[PDB]
Amino acid sequence: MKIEEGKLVIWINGDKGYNGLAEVGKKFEKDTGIKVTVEHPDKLEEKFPQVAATGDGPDIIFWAHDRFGGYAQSGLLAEITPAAAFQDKLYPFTWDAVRYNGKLIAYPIAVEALSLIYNKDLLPNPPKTWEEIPALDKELKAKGKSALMFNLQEPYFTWPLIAADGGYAFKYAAGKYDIKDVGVDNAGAKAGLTFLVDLIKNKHMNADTDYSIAEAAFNKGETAMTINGPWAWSNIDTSAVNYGVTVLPTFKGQPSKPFVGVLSAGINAASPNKELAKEFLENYLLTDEGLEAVNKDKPLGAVALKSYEEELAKDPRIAATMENAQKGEIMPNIPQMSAFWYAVRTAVINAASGRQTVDAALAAAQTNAAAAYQNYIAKSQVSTGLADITAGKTNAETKLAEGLTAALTDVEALGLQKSTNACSTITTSIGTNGASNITCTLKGTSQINSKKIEWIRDADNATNGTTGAWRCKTDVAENLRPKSCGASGS
Numbered sequence: 001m002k003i004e005e006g007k008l009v010i011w012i013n014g015d016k017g018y019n020g021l022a023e024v025g026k027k028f029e030k031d032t033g034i035k036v037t038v039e040h041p042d043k044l045e046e047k048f049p050q051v052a053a054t055g056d057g058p059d060i061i062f063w064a065h066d067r068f069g070g071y072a073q074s075g076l077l078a079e080i081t082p083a084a085a086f087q088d089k090l091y092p093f094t095w096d097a098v099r100y101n102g103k104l105i106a107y108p109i110a111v112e113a114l115s116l117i118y119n120k121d122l123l124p125n126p127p128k129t130w131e132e133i134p135a136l137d138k139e140l141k142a143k144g145k146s147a148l149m150f151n152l153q154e155p156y157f158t159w160p161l162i163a164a165d166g167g168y169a170f171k172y173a174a175g176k177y178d179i180k181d182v183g184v185d186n187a188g189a190k191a192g193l194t195f196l197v198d199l200i201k202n203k204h205m206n207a208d209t210d211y212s213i214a215e216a217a218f219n220k221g222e223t224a225m226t227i228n229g230p231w232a233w234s235n236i237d238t239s240a241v242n243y244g245v246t247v248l249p250t251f252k253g254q255p256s257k258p259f260v261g262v263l264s265a266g267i268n269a270a271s272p273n274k275e276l277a278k279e280f281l282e283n284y285l286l287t288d289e290g291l292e293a294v295n296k297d298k299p300l301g302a303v304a305l306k307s308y309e310e311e312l313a314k315d316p317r318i319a320a321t322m323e324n325a326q327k328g329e330i331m332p333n334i335p336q337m338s339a340f341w342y343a344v345r346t347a348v349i350n351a352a353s354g355r356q357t358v359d360a361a362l363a364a365a366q367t368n369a370a371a372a373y374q375n376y377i378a379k380s381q382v383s384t385g386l387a388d389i390t391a392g393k394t395n396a397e398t399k400l401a402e403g404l405t406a407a408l409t410d411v412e413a414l415g416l417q418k419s420t421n422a423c424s425t426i427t428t429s430i431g432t433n434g435a436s437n438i439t440c441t442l443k444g445t446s447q448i449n450s451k452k453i454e455w456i457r458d459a460d461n462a463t464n465g466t467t468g469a470w471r472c473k474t475d476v477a478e479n480l481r482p483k484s485c486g487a488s489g490s
């Protein structure tokens, strides 16, 4: 995990063209001798602040710009300062995306916006309005298909509809984003989410739907439409689907308003290789042939490099991406953005699944998004601590299945570390009778520091023939507890 000199480790999301990026990397490993590793860990954007607080992680992190103000405020990013000559090569508005407190803190790579993607053979005339979709879906179910499937687990995909009639994240006022003026619970935001939940209520889509099943359903021709970004075009290309990319539908006569992201590359503050990273980025990646290499793996969208974008912009698909982008807004990059996104994620999931009403869900989102910074941090650190031990359960169950002659107290044997950034110690006792605990002692903001979160397993019972269950317990305050953890008792 610690950073090696004379070497570059790069993190980029699994849905981007990382193999293409590794090719720019293997070429770098030719003109310099400097090796390049490209990895795509799960939840890298969450992992990065965890590992880079202790001087670990990649030399270079790729993500949309909205997460980078948080990174910068937390101290984790070197200021990038390119020559004015290099800046002339990228559109000014992309540099604006990656400027925080007047300093640039990442290189902008590409501009992304969601579009309506549709099956031309199945649906030659896609709907201009969201309101058209229930009837269209009814028609399509009769033929054994569906009108629309997209990822309901990430708020990024439902935001264009929430924003259509007036939802907003943070109000921009007197030259700054007002972090206490949140627009996720106004009338327009309410009407947007209501329309989505009505779709689900009336069985035109399924609350369960995630990225993989929507992508699979579309690329196999089972659904006529999906909502996605340019990175998804590659997989459809290898499919038998004749698809188009077009303007998102309107809602109450209003354009859908996607939050537009700028894929960006940050340089780790603890990296020994800030100059090697700067040259890889400026003189290998951000060139026509570097971007082309990444693009032919998975399309980047409208790239920041003027020279290359001139060609790319002749693609009707990229013209559709930019049309949608113009109807939406470039995301803020302020630190409160992740609090906003986590708040809206829960709201959409809870409303869609029927656990809360739309008004209740958005009311709670408004409070969570406008919460004080330590509140968001405390919830995050507790969640992280829990994730740091949850992998231990499954492995514990495999050991119990073989049978134990002695209680197991080695957390390594469960695939766990003895400590993490969120857990000052991780301990375990997997008992011979199944009674067990895997315990995180939490470390971070004073609200949760030295509290415990743990998985508790009851004993199996051989006389009764019963198997013990797992329960998440914590002595953290109730309003800070994650979903499905309760308090402890004795």
Ligand SMILES: OC[C@H]1O[C@H](O[C@H]2[C@H](O)[C@@H](O)[C@@H](O[C@H]3[C@H](O)[C@@H](O)[C@@H](O)O[C@@H]3CO)O[C@@H]2CO)[C@H](O)[C@@H](O)[C@@H]1O
Pocket (backbone or CB within 6 Å): 013, 015, 045, 046, 064, 065, 066, 067, 112, 153, 154, 155, 156, 157, 229, 261, 338, 341, 342, 345
């Ligand atoms: O939902 C919780 C989630 O919120 C935040 O994730 C947001 C991203 O920061 C934001 O950029 C956008 O992510 C999308 C990418 O821009 C796009 O390139 C592609 O990868 O799809 C992404 C969405 O799946 O939207 C998400 C919110 O959905 C936060 O950073 C995450 O840590 C958090 O898990």
